[PDB]
């Protein structure tokens, strides 16, 4: 029993984190096989980050201008190369701790674990959602750039996120491990803002299902509804449309508790209009949207890695 913001065990990723230094800029890289992945902006001085030409800045730079530290051991670079917004440094040694892994791109609403690192040393781990506006509400200070986000599926680490930069609202922006940014952002010290963020309806519903499975039942009513009727309520309260796809995904939790989804939507509908009337759900006054259906099921079934 119990329900918490649960991160994946970080041991497989801790073994891949290294320090990447270029001039005075230090930040984190991911060392898999003989390649070190990190943000390309490690080749930028404070002057050059205002309006950088990366291909031009990179063409100057040679292998010996990149210091890579894996703990207290030096890795010699023997190849640099750019893919979209990530720098690929080839090194003389394959990482003996390379896990089974893949690069994947997550959708808004999907969650992942972030391993925060400073000077290539992991400091902490936490669970995140890719927001609809493609930002993450992380906790990064200076030197956290190159920190990665990941899911584990059996023995396989799926890397989905590399931290690049902070926005002025205190939220964060980054790429997939193939250097493609999540959201309409660019790697440049500049006036960039997050769009109007929305609430991930399917996640809130999944977390209400987690409440019911943990004995919190006070928000259930006798009333059902329709997707069309519920979505008009969602739109009004800055909630994502709920799709037939989302209803299918909530199928296992709808079966395991005997609450329809349109039933649970009716509950959310009423929670959206009338508020929580001073009560809480899973020790929260606001509706949590950073737990997927899969996250709920995995934690109320106890799958291991």
Q: Which residues 119-148 are close enough to bind ligand UQZ by CB under 6 A?
A: 140-142, 144-145
Interface with its own copies, residue 141, by CB under 8 A: yes
CB 130 within 8 A of CB 108: yes
Interface with its own copies, residue 46, by CB under 8 A: no
Helix/strand/coil for 61? coil
- The binder of 174, among ligand UQZ, its own copies, none, by C-beta within 5 to 8 A per type, is none
CB 208 within 8 A of CB 268: yes
Catalytically annotated residues: 41, 145
CB 140 within 8 A of CB 106: no
Interaction pattern, residues 14-33, with its own copies; x per rule: CB under 8 A: xx------------------
CB 128 within 8 A of CB 114: yes
Query: Candidates 40-48, 131-139, 199-207, 233-241 — which segment interacts with its own copies by CB under 8 A?
Result: 131-139
Interface with its own copies, residue 5, by CB under 8 A: yes
Interface with its own copies, residue 116, by CB under 8 A: yes
| Distance between start and end Cα atoms, the chain | 20
Query: Candidates 5-13, 113-121, 186-194, 221-229 — which segment interacts with ligand UQZ by CB under 6 A?
Result: 186-194
Least Å distance, CB 80 to its own copies, is 26
Which residue in 39, 138, 146, 179 binds its own copies (CB under 8 A)? Answer: 138
HSE-up of 147 (CA within 13 Å, CB side)? 30
Q: Which residues 151-180 are close enough to bind its own copies by CB under 8 A?
A: 166, 170-172
Which residue in 52, 109, 122, 149 binds its own copies (CB under 8 A)? Answer: 122
- The binder of 41, among its own copies, ligand UQZ, none, by C-beta within 5 to 8 A per type, is ligand UQZ
C-alpha–C-alpha distance, residues 69 and 197, integer Å: 38
Least Å distance, CB 48 to ligand UQZ, is 7
Least Å distance, CB 138 to ligand UQZ, is 8
Size of the site for its own copies (CB under 8 A): 52
Residue 279, Cβ density class (10 Å: 0-12 exposed, 13-18 middle, ≥19 buried): exposed
C-alpha–C-alpha distance, residues 226 and 146, integer Å: 44
Interface with its own copies, residue 238, by CB under 8 A: no
Interface with ligand UQZ, residue 188, by CB under 6 A: yes
C-alpha–C-alpha distance, residues 135 and 111, integer Å: 12
In this structure, the number of other CB atoms found within 10 A of the CB of residue 209 comes to 24
Q: Is the CB of 230 or the CB of 239 nearer to its own copies?
A: 239
Least Å distance, CB 137 to ligand UQZ, is 13
Segment holding 163, helix H or strand E: strand 156-166
- Which tokens in the block code for residue 220? 């259930």
CB 135 within 8 A of CB 163: no
What is the CA 100 to chain-centroid distance, rounded? 20
Pairing assessment for the beta strands 73-75 and 82-83 based on DSSP bridges: unpaired
CB 189 within 8 A of CB 169: no
Interface with its own copies, residue 2, by CB under 8 A: yes
Q: Note the residues at the interface with ligand UQZ (CB under 6 A).
A: 41, 44, 49, 52, 140-142, 144-145, 165-166, 187-189
Q: Note the residues at the interface with its own copies (CB under 8 A).
A: 1-12, 14-15, 115-119, 121-126, 128, 137-141, 143-144, 166, 170-172, 214-215, 280, 283-286, 298-305
């Amino acid at each position: 029993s119990g329900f918490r913001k649960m991160a994946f065990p970080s041991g497989k990723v801790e073994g891949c984190m290294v320090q990447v230094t270029c001039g005075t800029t230090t930040l984190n890289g991911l060392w898999l096989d003989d390649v070190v992945y990190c943000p390309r902006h490690v080749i930028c001085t404070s002057e050059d980050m205002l309006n950088p030409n990366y291909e031009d800045l990179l063409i100057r730079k040679s292998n010996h201008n990149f210091l890579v530290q894996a703990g207290n051991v030096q890795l010699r670079v023997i190849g640099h190369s750019m893919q979209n917004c990530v720098l690929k440094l080839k090194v003389d040694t394959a990482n003996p701790k390379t896990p089974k892994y893949k690069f994947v791109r997550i959708q808004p609403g999907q969650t992942f674990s972030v391993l925060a690192c400073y000077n290539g040393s992991p400091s902490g781990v936490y669970q995140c959602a890719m927001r609809p506006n493609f930002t993450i509400k992380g906790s990064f200070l200076n030197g956290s750039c190159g920190s990665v986000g990941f899911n584990i599926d059996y023995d396989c680490v799926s890397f989905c996120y590399m931290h690049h930069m902070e926005l002025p609202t205190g939220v964060h922006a980054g790429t997939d491990l193939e250097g493609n940014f999540y959201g309409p952002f660019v790697d440049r010290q500049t006036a960039q803002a997050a769009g109007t963020d929305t609430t991930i309806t399917v996640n809130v519903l999944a977390w209400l299902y987690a409440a019911v499975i943990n004995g919190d039942r006070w928000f259930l009513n006798r009333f059902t509804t329709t997707l069309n009727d519920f979505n008009l309520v969602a739109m009004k309260y800055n909630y994502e449309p709920l799709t037939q796809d989302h209803v299918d995904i909530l199928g296992p939790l709808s079966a395991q508790t005997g609450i329809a989804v349109l039933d649970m939507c009716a509950s959310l509908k009423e929670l959206l209009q009338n508020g929580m009337n001073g009560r809480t759900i899973l020790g929260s006054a606001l509706l949590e949207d950073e737990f997927t259906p899969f996250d709920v099921v995995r934690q109320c079934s106890g799958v291991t890695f």
